[PDB]
Enzyme design. Structure first.
Site, PDB file in Angstrom:
ATOM      1  N   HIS B 201       0.765  -1.113  -0.038  1.00 33.10           N
ATOM      2  CA  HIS B 201       0.127   0.018   0.020  1.00 33.10           C
ATOM      3  C   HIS B 201       0.755   1.074  -0.082  1.00 33.10           C
ATOM      4  O   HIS B 201       0.459   2.408  -0.342  1.00 33.10           O
ATOM      5  CB  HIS B 201      -0.906   0.076   1.106  1.00 33.10           C
ATOM      6  CG  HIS B 201      -1.702  -1.041   1.145  1.00 33.10           C
ATOM      7  ND1 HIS B 201      -2.723  -1.512   2.283  1.00 33.10           N
ATOM      8  CD2 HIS B 201      -2.347  -1.901   0.016  1.00 33.10           C
ATOM      9  CE1 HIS B 201      -3.425  -2.250   1.762  1.00 33.10           C
ATOM     10  NE2 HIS B 201      -3.470  -2.402   0.712  1.00 33.10           N
ATOM     11  N   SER B 205      -0.364  -0.708  -6.296  1.00 38.93           N
ATOM     12  CA  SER B 205      -0.159  -1.910  -6.979  1.00 38.93           C
ATOM     13  C   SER B 205       0.273  -1.720  -8.286  1.00 38.93           C
ATOM     14  O   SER B 205      -0.481  -0.854  -9.082  1.00 38.93           O
ATOM     15  CB  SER B 205      -1.673  -2.873  -6.770  1.00 38.93           C
ATOM     16  OG  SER B 205      -1.656  -3.961  -7.222  1.00 38.93           O
ATOM     17  N   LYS B 227     -15.059  -8.527  -7.358  1.00 41.54           N
ATOM     18  CA  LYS B 227     -14.087  -9.492  -8.384  1.00 41.54           C
ATOM     19  C   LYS B 227     -13.433 -10.507  -7.493  1.00 41.54           C
ATOM     20  O   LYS B 227     -13.478 -11.399  -7.901  1.00 41.54           O
ATOM     21  CB  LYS B 227     -13.163  -8.374  -9.128  1.00 41.54           C
ATOM     22  CG  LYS B 227     -12.180  -9.168  -9.864  1.00 41.54           C
ATOM     23  CD  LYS B 227     -11.265  -8.328 -10.714  1.00 41.54           C
ATOM     24  CE  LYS B 227     -10.046  -8.872 -11.742  1.00 41.54           C
ATOM     25  NZ  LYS B 227     -11.090  -9.612 -12.785  1.00 41.54           N
ATOM     26  N   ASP B 228     -12.920 -10.163  -6.168  1.00 41.01           N
ATOM     27  CA  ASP B 228     -11.971 -11.000  -5.445  1.00 41.01           C
ATOM     28  C   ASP B 228     -13.254 -12.092  -4.991  1.00 41.01           C
ATOM     29  O   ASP B 228     -12.877 -13.189  -5.022  1.00 41.01           O
ATOM     30  CB  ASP B 228     -11.346 -10.252  -4.317  1.00 41.01           C
ATOM     31  CG  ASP B 228     -10.224  -9.237  -4.638  1.00 41.01           C
ATOM     32  OD1 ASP B 228     -10.069  -9.459  -6.155  1.00 41.01           O
ATOM     33  OD2 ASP B 228      -9.693  -8.884  -3.871  1.00 41.01           O
ATOM     34  N   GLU B 271       6.296 -33.942  -0.863  1.00 42.66           N
ATOM     35  CA  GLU B 271       4.935 -33.475  -1.724  1.00 42.66           C
ATOM     36  C   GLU B 271       5.382 -32.644  -2.973  1.00 42.66           C
ATOM     37  O   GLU B 271       6.525 -32.580  -3.282  1.00 42.66           O
ATOM     38  CB  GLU B 271       4.084 -32.386  -0.578  1.00 42.66           C
ATOM     39  CG  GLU B 271       3.419 -33.224   0.068  1.00 42.66           C
ATOM     40  CD  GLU B 271       2.085 -33.490  -0.353  1.00 42.66           C
ATOM     41  OE1 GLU B 271       1.999 -33.685  -1.496  1.00 42.66           O
ATOM     42  OE2 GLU B 271       1.225 -33.622   0.580  1.00 42.66           O
TER      43      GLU B 271
HETATM   44  C1  HEM Z   1      -0.561 -22.351   5.474  1.00 41.57           C
HETATM   45  C2  HEM Z   1      -1.011 -22.939   6.420  1.00 41.57           C
HETATM   46  C3  HEM Z   1      -0.913 -24.462   6.537  1.00 41.57           C
HETATM   47  C4  HEM Z   1      -0.527 -25.206   5.476  1.00 41.57           C
HETATM   48  C5  HEM Z   1       0.128 -25.055   4.192  1.00 41.57           C
HETATM   49  C6  HEM Z   1      -0.495 -26.890   6.056  1.00 41.57           C
HETATM   50  C7  HEM Z   1      -0.096 -27.927   5.593  1.00 41.57           C
HETATM   51  C8  HEM Z   1      -0.355 -29.257   5.900  1.00 41.57           C
HETATM   52  C9  HEM Z   1      -0.085 -30.420   5.381  1.00 41.57           C
HETATM   53  C10 HEM Z   1       0.275 -30.664   3.886  1.00 41.57           C
HETATM   54  C11 HEM Z   1      -0.652 -31.570   5.989  1.00 41.57           C
HETATM   55  C12 HEM Z   1      -0.670 -32.831   5.745  1.00 41.57           C
HETATM   56  C13 HEM Z   1      -1.981 -33.303   5.340  1.00 41.57           C
HETATM   57  C14 HEM Z   1      -2.332 -34.916   5.333  1.00 41.57           C
HETATM   58  O1  HEM Z   1      -1.051 -35.329   5.037  1.00 41.57           O
HETATM   59  O2  HEM Z   1      -3.442 -35.323   5.005  1.00 41.57           O
HETATM   60  C15 HEM Z   1      -0.950 -30.794   7.326  1.00 41.57           C
HETATM   61  C16 HEM Z   1      -1.532 -31.703   8.323  1.00 41.57           C
HETATM   62  C17 HEM Z   1      -2.182 -30.946   9.577  1.00 41.57           C
HETATM   63  N1  HEM Z   1      -1.704 -29.680   9.944  1.00 41.57           N
HETATM   64 FE1  HEM Z   1      -1.540 -28.213   8.649  1.00 41.57          FE
HETATM   65  N2  HEM Z   1      -1.052 -26.718   7.514  1.00 41.57           N
HETATM   66  C18 HEM Z   1      -1.116 -25.198   7.841  1.00 41.57           C
HETATM   67  C19 HEM Z   1      -2.015 -24.865   8.828  1.00 41.57           C
HETATM   68  C20 HEM Z   1      -2.080 -25.692   9.925  1.00 41.57           C
HETATM   69  C21 HEM Z   1      -2.720 -25.114  11.099  1.00 41.57           C
HETATM   70  C22 HEM Z   1      -2.791 -23.412  11.390  1.00 41.57           C
HETATM   71  C23 HEM Z   1      -2.981 -25.752  12.038  1.00 41.57           C
HETATM   72  C24 HEM Z   1      -3.311 -25.916  13.653  1.00 41.57           C
HETATM   73  C25 HEM Z   1      -3.870 -24.842  14.127  1.00 41.57           C
HETATM   74  C26 HEM Z   1      -2.525 -27.200  11.218  1.00 41.57           C
HETATM   75  C27 HEM Z   1      -2.736 -28.319  11.921  1.00 41.57           C
HETATM   76  C28 HEM Z   1      -2.524 -29.556  11.048  1.00 41.57           C
HETATM   77  C29 HEM Z   1      -2.964 -30.941  11.699  1.00 41.57           C
HETATM   78  C30 HEM Z   1      -3.818 -31.135  12.963  1.00 41.57           C
HETATM   79  C31 HEM Z   1      -2.831 -31.835  10.886  1.00 41.57           C
HETATM   80  C32 HEM Z   1      -3.094 -33.075  10.685  1.00 41.57           C
HETATM   81  C33 HEM Z   1      -3.948 -33.536   9.610  1.00 41.57           C
HETATM   82  C34 HEM Z   1      -3.822 -35.037   8.917  1.00 41.57           C
HETATM   83  O3  HEM Z   1      -3.299 -35.908   9.774  1.00 41.57           O
HETATM   84  O4  HEM Z   1      -4.243 -35.242   8.141  1.00 41.57           O
HETATM   85  N3  HEM Z   1      -2.012 -26.851  10.088  1.00 41.57           N
HETATM   86  N4  HEM Z   1      -0.768 -29.409   7.342  1.00 41.57           N
HETATM   87  C1  HEM Z   2       0.868 -16.750   1.909  1.00 43.78           C
HETATM   88  C2  HEM Z   2       1.771 -16.158   0.979  1.00 43.78           C
HETATM   89  C3  HEM Z   2       1.118 -14.951   0.372  1.00 43.78           C
HETATM   90  C4  HEM Z   2       0.085 -14.093   0.801  1.00 43.78           C
HETATM   91  C5  HEM Z   2      -0.858 -14.194   1.795  1.00 43.78           C
HETATM   92  C6  HEM Z   2       0.258 -12.741   0.110  1.00 43.78           C
HETATM   93  C7  HEM Z   2      -0.484 -11.791  -0.043  1.00 43.78           C
HETATM   94  C8  HEM Z   2      -0.685 -10.573  -1.114  1.00 43.78           C
HETATM   95  C9  HEM Z   2      -1.764  -9.824  -1.451  1.00 43.78           C
HETATM   96  C10 HEM Z   2      -2.833 -10.020  -0.581  1.00 43.78           C
HETATM   97  C11 HEM Z   2      -1.327  -9.148  -2.251  1.00 43.78           C
HETATM   98  C12 HEM Z   2      -2.160  -8.019  -2.783  1.00 43.78           C
HETATM   99  C13 HEM Z   2      -3.117  -8.837  -3.988  1.00 43.78           C
HETATM  100  C14 HEM Z   2      -2.367  -8.868  -5.309  1.00 43.78           C
HETATM  101  O1  HEM Z   2      -1.593  -7.928  -5.649  1.00 43.78           O
HETATM  102  O2  HEM Z   2      -2.662  -9.585  -5.970  1.00 43.78           O
HETATM  103  C15 HEM Z   2       0.018  -9.433  -2.825  1.00 43.78           C
HETATM  104  C16 HEM Z   2       0.802  -8.925  -3.715  1.00 43.78           C
HETATM  105  C17 HEM Z   2       2.235  -9.177  -3.708  1.00 43.78           C
HETATM  106  N1  HEM Z   2       2.778 -10.199  -3.323  1.00 43.78           N
HETATM  107 FE1  HEM Z   2       1.888 -11.547  -2.304  1.00 43.78          FE
HETATM  108  N2  HEM Z   2       1.334 -13.024  -0.705  1.00 43.78           N
HETATM  109  C18 HEM Z   2       2.106 -14.077  -0.540  1.00 43.78           C
HETATM  110  C19 HEM Z   2       3.012 -14.602  -1.313  1.00 43.78           C
HETATM  111  C20 HEM Z   2       3.941 -13.885  -1.835  1.00 43.78           C
HETATM  112  C21 HEM Z   2       5.053 -14.321  -2.466  1.00 43.78           C
HETATM  113  C22 HEM Z   2       5.764 -15.888  -2.146  1.00 43.78           C
HETATM  114  C23 HEM Z   2       5.757 -13.455  -3.189  1.00 43.78           C
HETATM  115  C24 HEM Z   2       7.058 -13.389  -3.739  1.00 43.78           C
HETATM  116  C25 HEM Z   2       8.102 -14.169  -3.903  1.00 43.78           C
HETATM  117  C26 HEM Z   2       4.817 -12.374  -3.034  1.00 43.78           C
HETATM  118  C27 HEM Z   2       4.951 -10.940  -3.479  1.00 43.78           C
HETATM  119  C28 HEM Z   2       4.126 -10.095  -3.607  1.00 43.78           C
HETATM  120  C29 HEM Z   2       4.271  -8.982  -4.612  1.00 43.78           C
HETATM  121  C30 HEM Z   2       5.436  -8.458  -5.185  1.00 43.78           C
HETATM  122  C31 HEM Z   2       3.032  -8.334  -4.648  1.00 43.78           C
HETATM  123  C32 HEM Z   2       2.766  -7.060  -5.387  1.00 43.78           C
HETATM  124  C33 HEM Z   2       1.932  -7.599  -6.836  1.00 43.78           C
HETATM  125  C34 HEM Z   2       1.442  -6.375  -7.200  1.00 43.78           C
HETATM  126  O3  HEM Z   2       1.686  -5.080  -7.119  1.00 43.78           O
HETATM  127  O4  HEM Z   2       0.942  -6.320  -8.746  1.00 43.78           O
HETATM  128  N3  HEM Z   2       3.808 -12.723  -2.378  1.00 43.78           N
HETATM  129  N4  HEM Z   2       0.374 -10.420  -1.859  1.00 43.78           N
END
Ligand code: HEM
Ligand code: HEM
Lengths: 101, 379, 51, 60, 120, 53, 79
Positions: B201, B205, B227-228, B271
């Site tokens: 911000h 953008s 749109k979002d 994965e």
């Molecule tokens: C960006 C956020 C997250 C990502 C990318 C992520 C990713 C993953 C992945 C890939 C698995 C494997 C699931 C499976 O093998 O079936 C998993 C399992 C799990 N995650 Fe997350 N996780 C996230 C956030 C969280 C959060 C915030 C919590 C708890 C507050 C959480 C708790 C767990 C639990 C309890 C499992 C076990 C589910 C299972 O055994 O299938 N995760 N997560």
């Molecule tokens: C959980 C992961 C992420 C979240 C929640 C997030 C969140 C956001 C949001 C809400 C926006 C504004 C909406 C948009 O521009 O489309 C944005 C824009 C942007 N994000 Fe992400 N982002 C993530 C990952 C990343 C990563 C991995 C990168 C770079 C390696 C990145 C770099 C940027 C940049 C450069 C912008 C500006 C886009 C523009 O101005 O057009 N973000 N991000």
């Protein structure tokens, strides 16, 4: 030269800024030197640049391209910003050189 | 009198963030993937919180707890597969957003780009630690390999690996640590995303054309809000398709067997989102070289702003750069596929060439091509 | 790198080298102290008593 | 001669309160109707397999 | 000013909606009195009186006498004002013309949204 | 078949929910798209004219 | 900082807009939309497709080569 001009014209048509009515300098990245160059532009050219940019952004909003007769031709593209940008870069180079020694 | 939306402090912040934020009028559907990532993060937090109400981190009860969630908790399967497939959708949106930033020159926003790279690292760590939690065969052995990779670090590798493990190998201590970390990290991700949006911000953008769009700014509330929402509906459609029709499409079947530390599964692969990095790691024969290459693969986004040499911010007007960009995307798909495939005569050489091409495209071919384009435009 | 290649910057490097060297020593001692790095700490006379 | 849509606007959509009440009641009835219809569709597609379709044979 | 357009538009539309939805008797009496004074004051002098005569004959087909105007004003009540304002001002698409530094002027979607209240 | 039921006991319920979500998405996505178009038509039909003095 | 009032200076740019309720949500959606989509696809395809074509070729070659590698070699058992 003619071969170079041919490849340059091919690239110009390959790039789409002519299709949107923009000129080359309309598409330059607005760095600080470019910002100062824009600031120094005369009013007519600044207003024309602003309108061309706005029209292009509008066309991209609806994913449309300007009618082919209105496309900017390679010959008629005028590098309005280039003199001002060269002057700004020259001043910056002079300042950097003075800072060096 | 004053409008509460513009005067009350919390409402003031919310207004300036997503109500009266001046947004470019021409941002494409590639600019919805950020909001899709935010929605994915909130969904993952909610789903993981509800999963953790039934998950136990002890090795004796981890797999049994996952089975209890799947079969006995009311609608537990919905929550579990929502989490599992939402992680994949999360990484899809992350990759698409990184690609959008590369393509349209969004990396010129240095602070936002670097915070985004940090977010990417943290999200990948969260995914890896979460995958260990079900404690299947894939979880155990993938954790073993990925943690063992750190031992290549000279003079401290063994100590660092054993400290992270909590012991001589992956065991109950490691599982509990990974549960705690996987819990805490998403909130740090949210904070980093808040900083990310703040820096964004600050500079506005970037639009697809790459030209400053201050003349053509529109309010965010009456246009990009709906749109979002639409983008969120489409993403939810894809995610629910995965959840309710192919719940195990993106997951390896072996993870449904309890972890046996004495017998390895036929294939040990991470994965799908980690597969390109895994292929890069396997490409380099030396272990330390492989680890460094895996780190550089992600860290090159840090160097991407420096490498920029074109006079134009966006690639929309640079055809040759577009060809290079699509070559890079195809190369990433190739790397993912090779990382999937077993290490054998056809796949090894393709992986090595693909990794070399990845680094070459990012470092050498793209800047030289941009310089050539600048000369062609007489700039 | 083009801007920072001149007589003044070379002088500026010389002015700040003693400070940079001093801070590097602070980092060197702090790392050894925090980690209790026995390789370096064995040489120091009084601290050698720990091991 | 107002059309159906204009009548709907002037009756329920003009003021947000009546709009919301209409939305709520429609929500309830649509939930019921959609649930019934979709369940019928799924049962018909899977006719002969569902336990509810075969419980009578083993019950009593 | 350039930076006060949005606020003024918000307040103007708020007043419109307040009259449409929750007008009160006292302000209605004030408005009626102001209208009476404007009508009587304007029709002063040969030029305005002749202008009113001609325009009334062309438009109304008749010069509405001041007594008729007073009766019609007196019939106005808060209910009448709310009814007519809801008919002409509420949830109706407006027509907007701007000149000068009008960048802060809200986009038409916001202006149209302001024409109705989510509370009502 | 019994082993498949054992592995995935929510199979029939999953299919039912999938059908319901398919119908609900088929309803909603066009409607939300229509709302987006209704909001965006002002910009889409916008005509800009440059009138320099 | 960045607020609508002082974003930029623009002059003599007149914009005409229509109320949403006075205009159709989907105007010429298929009569104009489909040709526009075709035009966009034509512009993009030459740049986009060839890398993925090369990827498909590489993938097929790799799969076939691996399958050949697993296959028996008659010469090994000639003796
Ligand atoms: C960006 C956020 C997250 C990502 C990318 C992520 C990713 C993953 C992945 C890939 C698995 C494997 C699931 C499976 O093998 O079936 C998993 C399992 C799990 N995650 Fe997350 N996780 C996230 C956030 C969280 C959060 C915030 C919590 C708890 C507050 C959480 C708790 C767990 C639990 C309890 C499992 C076990 C589910 C299972 O055994 O299938 N995760 N997560
Ligand atoms: C959980 C992961 C992420 C979240 C929640 C997030 C969140 C956001 C949001 C809400 C926006 C504004 C909406 C948009 O521009 O489309 C944005 C824009 C942007 N994000 Fe992400 N982002 C993530 C990952 C990343 C990563 C991995 C990168 C770079 C390696 C990145 C770099 C940027 C940049 C450069 C912008 C500006 C886009 C523009 O101005 O057009 N973000 N991000």
């Amino acid at each position: 030269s003619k071969w170079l001009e041919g490849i340059r014209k091919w690239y110009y048509n390959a790039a789409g800024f002519n299709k949107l009515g923009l000129m080359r300098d309309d598409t330059i990245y607005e760095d600080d030197d470019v910002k100062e160059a824009i600031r120094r532009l005369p009013e007519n050219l600044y207003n024309d640049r602003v309108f061309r940019i706005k029209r292009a952004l509008d066309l991209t909003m609806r994913q449309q391209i300007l009618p082919k007769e209105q496309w900017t031709k390679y010959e008629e593209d005028k590098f309005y910003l280039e003199p001002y940008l060269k002057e700004v870069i020259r001043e910056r180079k002079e300042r950097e050189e003075w800072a060096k020694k | 009198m004053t409008n509460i939306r513009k005067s009350h402090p919390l409402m003031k912040i919310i207004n300036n963030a997503f109500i009266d934020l001046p947004a470019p009028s021409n941002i494409s559907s590639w600019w919805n993937f950020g909001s899709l990532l935010g929605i994915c993060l909130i969904l993952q937090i909610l789903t993981g919180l509800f999963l953790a109400m039934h998950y136990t981190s002890d090795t004796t009860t981890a797999f049994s707890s996952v089975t209890h969630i799947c079969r006995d908790v009311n609608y537990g399967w919905v929550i579990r597969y929502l989490h599992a497939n939402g992680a994949s959708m999360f990484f899809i949106c992350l990759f698409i957003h990184v690609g959008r930033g590369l393509y349209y020159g969004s990396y010129m926003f240095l602070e936002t780009w670097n915070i985004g790279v940090v977010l990417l690292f943290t999200v990948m760590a969260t995914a890896f630690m979460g995958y260990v939690l079900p404690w299947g065969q894939m979880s155990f052995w993938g954790a073993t390999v990925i943690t063992n990779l750190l031992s290549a670090i000279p003079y401290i590798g063994t100590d660092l690996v054993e400290w992270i493990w909590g012991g001589f190998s992956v065991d109950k201590a490691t599982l509990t640590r990974f549960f705690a970390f996987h819990f805490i990290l998403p909130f740090i991700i949210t904070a980093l995303a808040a900083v990310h949006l703040l820096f964004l911000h600050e500079t506005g953008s970037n639009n697809p054309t790459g030209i400053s769009s201050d003349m053509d700014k529109i309010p965010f509330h009456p246009y990009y809000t709906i749109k979002d929402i639409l983008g969120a509906l489409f993403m939810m459609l894809i995610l629910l398709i995965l959840v309710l029709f192919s719940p195990d499409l993106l997951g390896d079947p072996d993870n449904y067997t309890p972890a046996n530390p004495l017998n390895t599964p036929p294939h040990i692969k991470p994965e799908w989102y980690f597969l390109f990095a895994y292929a890069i790691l396997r490409s380099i024969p030396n272990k330390l070289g492989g680890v460094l290459a895996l780190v550089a693969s992600i860290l090159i986004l840090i160097l991407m702003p420096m490498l920029h040499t074109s006079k134009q911010r966006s690639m929309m007007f640079r055809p040759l750069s577009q060809c290079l960009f699509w070559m890079l995307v195809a190369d990433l798909i190739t790397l993912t596929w090779i990382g999937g495939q077993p290490v054998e005569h056809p796949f090894i050489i393709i992986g090595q060439l693909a990794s070399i091409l990845y680094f070459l495209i990012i470092l050498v071919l793209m800047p030289i091509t941009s310089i050539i384009e600048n000369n062609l435009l007489k700039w | 790198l083009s801007r920072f290649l001149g007589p003044r910057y070379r002088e500026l490097a010389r002015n700040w080298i003693p400070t940079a060297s001093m801070w590097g020593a602070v980092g060197a001692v702090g790392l050894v102290w925090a980690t209790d790095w026995r390789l370096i700490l064995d040489w120091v006379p009084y601290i050698n008593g720990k091991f | 001669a107002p059309t159906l849509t204009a009548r709907l606007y002037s009756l329920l959509f003009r003021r947000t309160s009546t709009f919301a009440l209409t939305i709520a009641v429609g929500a309830l009835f649509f939930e019921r109707a959609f649930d019934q219809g979709a369940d019928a569709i799924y049962e018909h597609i899977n006719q002969g397999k569902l336990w509810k379709h075969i419980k009578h044979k083993y019950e009593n | 000013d350039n930076m006060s357009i949005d606020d003024m538009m918000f307040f103007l539309q708020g007043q419109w909606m307040r009259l449409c939805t929750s007008a009160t008797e006292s302000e209605v009496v004030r408005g009626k009195n102001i209208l009476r004074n404007a009508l009587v004051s304007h029709l002063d002098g040969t030029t305005p009186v002749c202008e009113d005569i001609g325009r009334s004959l062309l438009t109304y087909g008749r010069r509405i006498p001041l007594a008729e105007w007073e009766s019609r004003i007196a019939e106005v009540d808060a209910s009448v004002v709310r009814e007519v304002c809801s008919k002409y001002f509420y949830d109706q698409c407006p027509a907007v013309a701007g000149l000068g530094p009008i960048e802060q002027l809200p986009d038409y979607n916001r202006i149209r949204s302001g024409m109705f209240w989510l509370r009502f | 078949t019994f082993l498949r039921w054992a592995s995935e006991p929510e199979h029939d319920h999953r299919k039912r929910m999938g059908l319901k979500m398919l119908m609900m998405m088929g309803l909603l996505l066009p409607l939300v798209y229509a709302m987006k178009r209704h909001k965006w038509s002002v910009l889409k039909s916008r005509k800009l004219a440059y009138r320099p003095p | 900082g960045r607020e609508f009032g002082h974003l930029t200076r623009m002059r003599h740019v007149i914009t005409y807009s229509l109320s949403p309720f006075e205009q159709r949500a989907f105007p010429h959606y298929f009569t104009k939309g489909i040709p526009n989509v075709l035009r966009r696809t034509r512009a993009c395809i030459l740049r986009v497709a060839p890398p993925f074509v090369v990827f498909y070729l590489v993938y097929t070659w790799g799969t076939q080569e691996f399958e050949k590698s697993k296959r028996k070699n008659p010469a090994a058992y000639e003796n």
